[PDB]
Design a protein around this nucleic acid. Structure first.
Ligand code: MG
Ligand code: MG
Ligand code: MG
Ligand code: MG
Ligand code: MG
Ligand code: MG
Ligand code: MG
Ligand code: MG
Ligand code: MG
Ligand code: MG
Ligand code: MG
Ligand code: MG
Ligand code: MG
Ligand code: MG
Ligand code: MG
Ligand code: MG
Ligand code: MG
Ligand code: MG
Ligand code: MG
Ligand code: MG
Ligand code: MG
Ligand code: MG
Ligand code: MG
Ligand code: MG
Ligand code: MG
Ligand code: MG
Ligand code: MG
Ligand code: MG
Ligand code: MG
Ligand code: MG
Ligand code: MG
Ligand code: MG
Ligand code: MG
Ligand code: MG
Ligand code: MG
Ligand code: MG
Ligand code: MG
Ligand code: MG
Ligand code: MG
Ligand code: MG
Ligand code: MG
Ligand code: MG
Ligand code: MG
Ligand code: MG
Ligand code: MG
Ligand code: MG
Ligand code: MG
Ligand code: MG
Ligand code: MG
Ligand code: MG
Ligand code: MG
Ligand code: MG
Ligand code: MG
Ligand code: MG
Ligand code: MG
Ligand code: MG
Ligand code: MG
Ligand code: MG
Ligand code: MG
Ligand code: MG
Ligand code: MG
Ligand code: MG
Ligand code: MG
Ligand code: MG
Ligand code: MG
Ligand code: MG
Ligand code: MG
Ligand code: MG
Ligand code: MG
Ligand code: MG
Ligand code: MG
Ligand code: MG
Ligand code: MG
Ligand code: MG
Ligand code: MG
Ligand code: MG
Ligand code: MG
Ligand code: MG
Ligand code: MG
Ligand code: MG
Ligand code: MG
Ligand code: MG
Ligand code: MG
Ligand code: MG
Ligand code: MG
Ligand code: MG
Ligand code: MG
Ligand code: MG
Ligand code: MG
Ligand code: MG
Ligand code: MG
Ligand code: MG
Ligand code: MG
Ligand code: MG
Ligand code: MG
Ligand code: MG
Ligand code: MG
Ligand code: MG
Ligand code: MG
Ligand code: MG
Ligand code: MG
Ligand code: MG
Ligand code: MG
Ligand code: MG
Ligand code: MG
Ligand code: MG
Ligand code: MG
Ligand code: MG
Ligand code: MG
Ligand code: MG
Ligand code: MG
Ligand code: MG
Ligand code: MG
Ligand code: MG
Ligand code: MG
Ligand code: MG
Ligand code: MG
Ligand code: MG
Ligand code: MG
Ligand code: MG
Ligand code: MG
Ligand code: MG
Ligand code: MG
Ligand code: MG
Ligand code: MG
Ligand code: MG
Ligand code: MG
Ligand code: MG
Ligand code: MG
Ligand code: MG
Ligand code: MG
Ligand code: MG
Ligand code: MG
Ligand code: MG
Ligand code: MG
Ligand code: MG
Ligand code: MG
Ligand code: MG
Ligand code: MG
Ligand code: MG
Ligand code: MG
Ligand code: MG
Ligand code: MG
Ligand code: MG
Ligand code: MG
Ligand code: MG
Ligand code: MG
Ligand code: MG
Ligand code: MG
Ligand code: MG
Ligand code: MG
Ligand code: MG
Ligand code: MG
Ligand code: ZN
Length: 63
RNA sequence: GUCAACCGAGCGUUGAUCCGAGGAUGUCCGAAUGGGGAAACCCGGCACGAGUGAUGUCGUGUCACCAGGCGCUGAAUAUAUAGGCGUCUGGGGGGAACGCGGGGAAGUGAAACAUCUCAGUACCCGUAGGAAGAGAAAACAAAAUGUGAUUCCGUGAGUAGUGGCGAGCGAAAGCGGAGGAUGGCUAAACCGUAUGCAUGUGAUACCGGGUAGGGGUUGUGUGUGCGGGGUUGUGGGACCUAUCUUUCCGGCUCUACCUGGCUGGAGGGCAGUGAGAAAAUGUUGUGGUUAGCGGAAAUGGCUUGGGAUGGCCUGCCGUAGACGGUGAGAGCCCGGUACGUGAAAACCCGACGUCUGUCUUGAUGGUGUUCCCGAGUAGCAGCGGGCCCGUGGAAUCUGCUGUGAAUCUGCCGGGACCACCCGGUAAGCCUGAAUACUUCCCAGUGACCGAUAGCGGAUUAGUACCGUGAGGGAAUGGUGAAAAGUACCCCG
RNA sequence: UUUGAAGAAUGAGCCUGCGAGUCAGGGACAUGUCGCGAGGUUAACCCGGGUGGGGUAGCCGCAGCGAAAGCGAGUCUGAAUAGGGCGUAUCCACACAAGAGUGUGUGGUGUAGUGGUGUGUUCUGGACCCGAAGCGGAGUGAUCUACCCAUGGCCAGGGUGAAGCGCGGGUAAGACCGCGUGGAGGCCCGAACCCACUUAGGUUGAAGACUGAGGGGAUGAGCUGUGGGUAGGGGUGAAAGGCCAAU
RNA sequence: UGCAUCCGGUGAAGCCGCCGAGUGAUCGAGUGGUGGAGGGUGUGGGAGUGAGAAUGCAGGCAUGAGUAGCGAUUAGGCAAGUGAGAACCUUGCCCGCCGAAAGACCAAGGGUUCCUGGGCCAGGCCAGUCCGCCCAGGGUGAGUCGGGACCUAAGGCGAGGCCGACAGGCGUAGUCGAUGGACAACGGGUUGAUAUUCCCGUACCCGUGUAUGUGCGUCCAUGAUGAAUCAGCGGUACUAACCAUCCAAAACCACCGUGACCGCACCUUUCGGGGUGUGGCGUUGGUGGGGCUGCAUGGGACCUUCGUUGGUAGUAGUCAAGCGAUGGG
RNA sequence: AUAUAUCCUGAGAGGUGAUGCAUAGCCGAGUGAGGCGAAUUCGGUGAUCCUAUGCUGCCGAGAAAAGCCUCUAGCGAGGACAUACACGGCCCGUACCCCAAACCAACACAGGUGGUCAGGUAGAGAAUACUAAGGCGUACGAGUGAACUAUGGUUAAGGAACUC
RNA sequence: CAAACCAGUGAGAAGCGACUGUUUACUAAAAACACAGGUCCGUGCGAAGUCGCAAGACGAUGUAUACGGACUGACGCCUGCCCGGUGCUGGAAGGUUAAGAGGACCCGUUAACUCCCUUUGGGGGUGAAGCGGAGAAUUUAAGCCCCAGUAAACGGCGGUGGUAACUAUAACCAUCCUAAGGUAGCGAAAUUCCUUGUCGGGUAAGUUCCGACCUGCACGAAUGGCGUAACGACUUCUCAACUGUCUCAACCAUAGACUCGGCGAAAUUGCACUACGAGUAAAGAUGCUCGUUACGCGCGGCAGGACGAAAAGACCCCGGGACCUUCACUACAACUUGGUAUUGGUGCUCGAUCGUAUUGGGCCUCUAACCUCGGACCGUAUAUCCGGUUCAGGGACAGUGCCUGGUGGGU
RNA sequence: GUGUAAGUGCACAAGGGAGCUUGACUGCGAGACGGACAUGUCGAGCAGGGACGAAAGUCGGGACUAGUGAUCCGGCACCUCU
């Protein structure tokens, strides 16, 4: 819940809301997961904290 | 140097001290950086010298972490990588405010109270700078054939608006001003090179007239890397086809001989320490700063007077009658005042001949047909945030999650939203001046205080003292003009 | 302060100093007063080591009515002369009506606001002065106490006598019992130590919690030195709303 | 503050009196005494502008008052000395009190309170020659005691690492961290103060080195062994069989029950269905007899698998001494 | 091999240490130092001190690491073992107080503060009573038969009738 | 003749608690706390539950004969009946409902037009495709509603009337209603208001005590009932000794109080040449009226007044705080669902334009995303952290985000 | 006796019946009453249309006095408002 490696997406802070509409401070943390992505076409794969936005950005590739 | 005096030793006409510029010296703790640690203290490794009969012993240096590179090494293992070393360059902490940015509340008002307000305030945190930040419209405007980056002022106006439509909050457009730089580029529609991965009909296919010699720019798809030149506002650029064309040379579009498309070298540019090319090449103002020099004119006389600058009388000078001191009110007494002058050396602000780059293989004006200019971006569904705007009919901005575009008969804006037309190029980038602040220094000023005031602090003050801590936190000025601070005698 | 105080209602030991309606805003209004007058005035800003000059950007009134279109000395209402609401500053003289008080038409008197300066009030600012219980953010504390963690130390003396053990009884083996040994025990009495039950004194005390007589445990859930960790809406808590540095 | 400018060392402001005047807040070019350096008419201007109170604040001084108290449970008297003064100090005599302390050593802590010398304002709840007062001087002596050179617990810090909006939080290798473990000291004497430190006498254990006497190799060579090499075997028992033991796949013989068929006699509704007894099969429920061949279960042997040597190659490469760990016990 | 075999551990006792020292006292010498200097044996009691980190017995089952000894991985042509030898071992604390007028309590305060030493007579004793060593009478005193208060002693007879 | 110091009062009846023990430092040491005994429930091991926005650590280097939570509290006899309410536990067939998808209606705009007017589309309505606005129905999980269980889970266990051989009764039947309507035991008790209930014991006298009766206002069986040996600085009561606690105080030795010398305080304080009584009055007067009495001043004592001093009254009320409780409001932490993403494939089975079509649901597989706290290597000379490699197990689950619904005095 | 309590009124009816029918109108409103204020009450006359009565005239709710709710936010219809 810290940071996504490439997108640079630090979690943002905002306030929730009731139906009565009374505020309270809360947070949002980007959807971060690690995968053993492919780096070089030689087969070397490594792990990097990536979010869904980055994944669908598809800098990381699959076989 | 001072308290503080005092002595005692002493230093000077050759110029000692005093002030300024550069330099060296700088124990230890303290980012502390050789390891450790209860700060000012313990314990080592490595390289060079020295002394002892040698050791003992001594000095000197170097020895942190992280970041970024370079060279060497390489584990699982085969390549290679992590890791491992060693070396250069940076940063590390502190500082009053200001600025940016990440986060961010309640007391309070609403006469209660949740929305709301208090307010993005205090406070915490990470950054740089002397300013920062913002900054060249994807802005406004509204038919005028208008504005023309940002920033800061005074308006516009407590108006339009927002709000349990309450308390409250609060624009924009336009106008007048300060300051100005309409300011130049990178990277995708061709090519030369360092290139590789792939393959050969390995010859009739590759060079821009004619003769001749010579022997995979992949066939097909996709992605990545390297570039001249294409970056709209009347709507705009190129795989090919109609016109003038202000130097030369070579090599290319897989070869050699007209037409077409590029790159390299000899010459007018574009400018350059720059936000749009990078690194280097060096210096003149009586400019200032750091300290300094000169700088006028009454012993004038008398009176009170302890003491005169005072009262009276003369004469005084002034480009200087700000100021302070000297025995009471001083321009004619001293420090000094206007004015003039001045730096061996160093430093901040202003030009000028070594030396450097580029380009004139590039540039300017003229007639028609056919893969580029910011993508996970604009916009979208949900969720929230900032714009006066609290979902309200809600644009514009940002963003968390899922989604997701066109590229010129493209986009987005014009305050739900649509059509004709109206106006300006988003997703890349930087860039002075106007502005804010003052821990620090200088010079001046005050209808500012004059010791319970004024900074807590005119004095050994952030001390004594209190608290183990964070922290709190005092009271305490004047003898005299000068110490001439009471010799000596007497009581005790 | 009170309806009301000589008050036995509050405050004042005394003296001296210090101590309380201030201050800002083209803020708003009214009253004084000052200049000009259908006009009044400028902000910011530029240039005079000096308050000058420039600067009309802007604001208020000269016209109001209507929510608005819009109209305009009228306008709104309304289907409307058909009067009413609001203004036409305000009045004088002439005529027309009813004399529903006044309205409707003519000729003159012709409209007074604005910017200082000082003042009361309101305005937002802490807004006449001192004063709270408390909420929130950042930090400082476990040198007492609570708990716990590691390492050490402490518990004079004197009794009680489990299991177990051996022998003798007893079994067929037992089991069971007498005898001597053994000495367990949150066992007993009682010093150090640690506590706090009663009384007394003290309660401007020797002491911000004690002194003296007695008072319980006193080999353990014990106590004690040592050094460490647990931080505030949290700790800890053999639980009382206790302790967390006399709070 | 502005001003015509003045008042004053022939005495300003301030302080304390006196006089006179205004209805008031006051005033007086109104003065007497202290004071010895600045005030200021008038007319405006601006204010931190007027104190008795707020259990106000700070300072000073009141009263209760010369009152309460002088801080234990042990307690003194006296002689003589110093001194101005002597219950309180010094010396002496007796008395009393503690004596698991009210004595003697340390740690923690404090830091000069230790000793000597001088004086007694201030401090000691009184005086005070005395003091833990002040003033000056002196005083702290370690290879062997203690803290670092050593090692570690609880726990803290922490490269890299992991996680975290920032800050930071964790925890590995490591490094810190005593209240523990590790190495050596005794008695006497000494000054006014130090002592297991100084002196005396006698010992010790750790760290470096000496070089010889023991005396030991590597650079000679003797000892114990030790193990990485060519030729086959485990009656067990690969492959046609024999003796003995229980079982049955291609149903012969015999009976019986009858999926279903052909029917022979009787019963039954008038005849029907149907039941009973039986005959021929068929079985709702396919072996025995015999040989060729091929495979499956044990026997001896044929060629390749041994009873580790026959030369060699104790010819040559190896050292243990002496110290050798970030490792093991 | 069951051997008091062997090894390890081990307070204590004897000897040397020590013909030394100290010593009660003797002499001259006074604020007090100096020289000389006798005996220096026995038994018996006896610890909470030491053997002991031991022995027995119990469950609640009672640190780590180092130093030391020892074994080897990586070397090697000079180390091992003693001793005459004169050499060589840091820095810092070391005074004083330390159940107190010196520390923590604002004081020269009837409080608290951890470890060590533990005499004699009675006694079980580390209680208690009196004493040595040694240190104190802890800083207001002098005088007065009052109340009254506090600390105490004694009390005719009655014995809880006071009083919750 | 234990002569000193030192050195247990004892016994009886009972209440509560098993006891040793701990606690409200600095007013409460108990009957409270705590425990040893049991009970219920949760907890399958990267556990349950904790601290922590995370890694991670405790739990534990433990493993259901362990750990956590809650209740009662040795031991013995026991621990009755009630599942409507609230909870918890199982069952989701039905009804209601999330987000998310979605596209019928309705609405806006505009090319063409549509009457007539000119000549080179608007003024008297339709509505083009897209654009958009509100906008559908349709798919939806948990939960709630619903069905059962559960009381050592929180909790309840009645009233009404009638009904005997003299006498008061109910020991039997009928009423309502809820789920049932208090069983054993004990009971004017630590609960009993009348109440000092009545009776008996103890005393002359007993509102306390003990022992019984039961009219239990308003006991009661794990927020446990009844007894209980021992224990207790616990509660009540009685008895013998005991005594100055008392009848009823007396004397005496001590340190103060007193006088003398020395040093030298504090609270309070508008004034002060400060009497009495009756009256008056802001309603109890040293200070007013009236009358009485009284030379000025001290010292020791005693406390009735000076509404005496100390603390801006606790109680009460009035404008406000903090903490706490809960089915008060509004939320939020945590727990829980689905969709969506980290996201892959085959086979089957189910639908709206029995032989032609509808793309998603449910299942079984598999590796390859992902997890692994399994193993074994390496970084390493030492490393249980960590990173990489291999294999092994899982595996498209899980976890994680975002939206959403539940629950939510934990905050 | 007079719709719903009491008072005030009411026979000239405000009491019944019938006929007819909508004035329980539209826009104003001279002036008043009460109101601290927001509000609340009464009312002759003027313009269109209608109702009853031939006409005269009466008709702007019930014999009167109770039967009620501010502001915001929102919903719905019409207009020669933007
Ligand atoms: Mg991150
Ligand atoms: Mg924010
Ligand atoms: Mg908020
Ligand atoms: Mg996708
Ligand atoms: Mg210099
Ligand atoms: Mg130097
Ligand atoms: Mg360091
Ligand atoms: Mg460093
Ligand atoms: Mg590098
Ligand atoms: Mg490789
Ligand atoms: Mg409010
Ligand atoms: Mg309020
Ligand atoms: Mg607020
Ligand atoms: Mg705001
Ligand atoms: Mg700079
Ligand atoms: Mg800029
Ligand atoms: Mg404006
Ligand atoms: Mg307001
Ligand atoms: Mg180009
Ligand atoms: Mg180009
Ligand atoms: Mg155009
Ligand atoms: Mg000069
Ligand atoms: Mg003179
Ligand atoms: Mg001058
Ligand atoms: Mg002068
Ligand atoms: Mg001068
Ligand atoms: Mg809004
Ligand atoms: Mg909008
Ligand atoms: Mg463009
Ligand atoms: Mg500027
Ligand atoms: Mg402090
Ligand atoms: Mg009054
Ligand atoms: Mg009065
Ligand atoms: Mg009085
Ligand atoms: Mg009063
Ligand atoms: Mg009072
Ligand atoms: Mg009052
Ligand atoms: Mg008072
Ligand atoms: Mg104003
Ligand atoms: Mg005028
Ligand atoms: Mg001007
Ligand atoms: Mg209007
Ligand atoms: Mg109208
Ligand atoms: Mg003014
Ligand atoms: Mg706070
Ligand atoms: Mg701490
Ligand atoms: Mg037994
Ligand atoms: Mg025994
Ligand atoms: Mg006893
Ligand atoms: Mg006393
Ligand atoms: Mg205190
Ligand atoms: Mg007694
Ligand atoms: Mg115990
Ligand atoms: Mg802390
Ligand atoms: Mg709290
Ligand atoms: Mg309690
Ligand atoms: Mg309580
Ligand atoms: Mg406390
Ligand atoms: Mg004079
Ligand atoms: Mg004079
Ligand atoms: Mg004078
Ligand atoms: Mg003056
Ligand atoms: Mg003036
Ligand atoms: Mg004042
Ligand atoms: Mg005063
Ligand atoms: Mg007053
Ligand atoms: Mg006062
Ligand atoms: Mg007094
Ligand atoms: Mg007295
Ligand atoms: Mg006295
Ligand atoms: Mg005392
Ligand atoms: Mg004397
Ligand atoms: Mg004694
Ligand atoms: Mg003792
Ligand atoms: Mg003793
Ligand atoms: Mg200490
Ligand atoms: Mg002296
Ligand atoms: Mg003196
Ligand atoms: Mg004194
Ligand atoms: Mg001194
Ligand atoms: Mg690190
Ligand atoms: Mg760490
Ligand atoms: Mg660690
Ligand atoms: Mg260490
Ligand atoms: Mg240590
Ligand atoms: Mg010493
Ligand atoms: Mg010593
Ligand atoms: Mg040595
Ligand atoms: Mg030292
Ligand atoms: Mg010493
Ligand atoms: Mg000492
Ligand atoms: Mg002592
Ligand atoms: Mg003190
Ligand atoms: Mg004392
Ligand atoms: Mg004390
Ligand atoms: Mg103690
Ligand atoms: Mg003892
Ligand atoms: Mg004695
Ligand atoms: Mg003694
Ligand atoms: Mg007394
Ligand atoms: Mg007697
Ligand atoms: Mg008696
Ligand atoms: Mg009982
Ligand atoms: Mg008890
Ligand atoms: Mg007990
Ligand atoms: Mg207890
Ligand atoms: Mg207690
Ligand atoms: Mg206490
Ligand atoms: Mg208490
Ligand atoms: Mg108590
Ligand atoms: Mg208990
Ligand atoms: Mg039980
Ligand atoms: Mg239980
Ligand atoms: Mg249970
Ligand atoms: Mg778990
Ligand atoms: Mg209980
Ligand atoms: Mg049931
Ligand atoms: Mg129920
Ligand atoms: Mg549809
Ligand atoms: Mg439910
Ligand atoms: Mg009873
Ligand atoms: Mg009972
Ligand atoms: Mg009772
Ligand atoms: Mg009773
Ligand atoms: Mg009774
Ligand atoms: Mg009684
Ligand atoms: Mg009862
Ligand atoms: Mg009850
Ligand atoms: Mg039960
Ligand atoms: Mg129960
Ligand atoms: Mg209960
Ligand atoms: Mg019970
Ligand atoms: Mg019992
Ligand atoms: Mg008696
Ligand atoms: Mg008496
Ligand atoms: Mg007395
Ligand atoms: Mg006395
Ligand atoms: Mg005195
Ligand atoms: Mg009176
Ligand atoms: Mg009276
Ligand atoms: Mg009186
Ligand atoms: Mg009082
Ligand atoms: Mg109060
Ligand atoms: Mg209140
Ligand atoms: Mg609170
Ligand atoms: Mg989903
Ligand atoms: Mg999926
Ligand atoms: Mg609450
Ligand atoms: Mg009628
Ligand atoms: Mg009118
Ligand atoms: Mg009506
Ligand atoms: Mg009517
Ligand atoms: Mg509203
Ligand atoms: Zn990302």
């Amino acid at each position: 819940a810290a940071v996504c490696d490439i997108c640079g997406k630090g979690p943002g802070f905002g306030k929730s809301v009731s139906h009565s509409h009374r505020r309270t401070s809360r947070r949002w943390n980007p959807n971060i997961q690690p995968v053993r992505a492919v780096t070089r076409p030689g087969g070397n794969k490594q792990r990097i904290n990536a979010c869904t936005s980055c994944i669908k950005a598809g800098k990381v590739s699959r076989a």
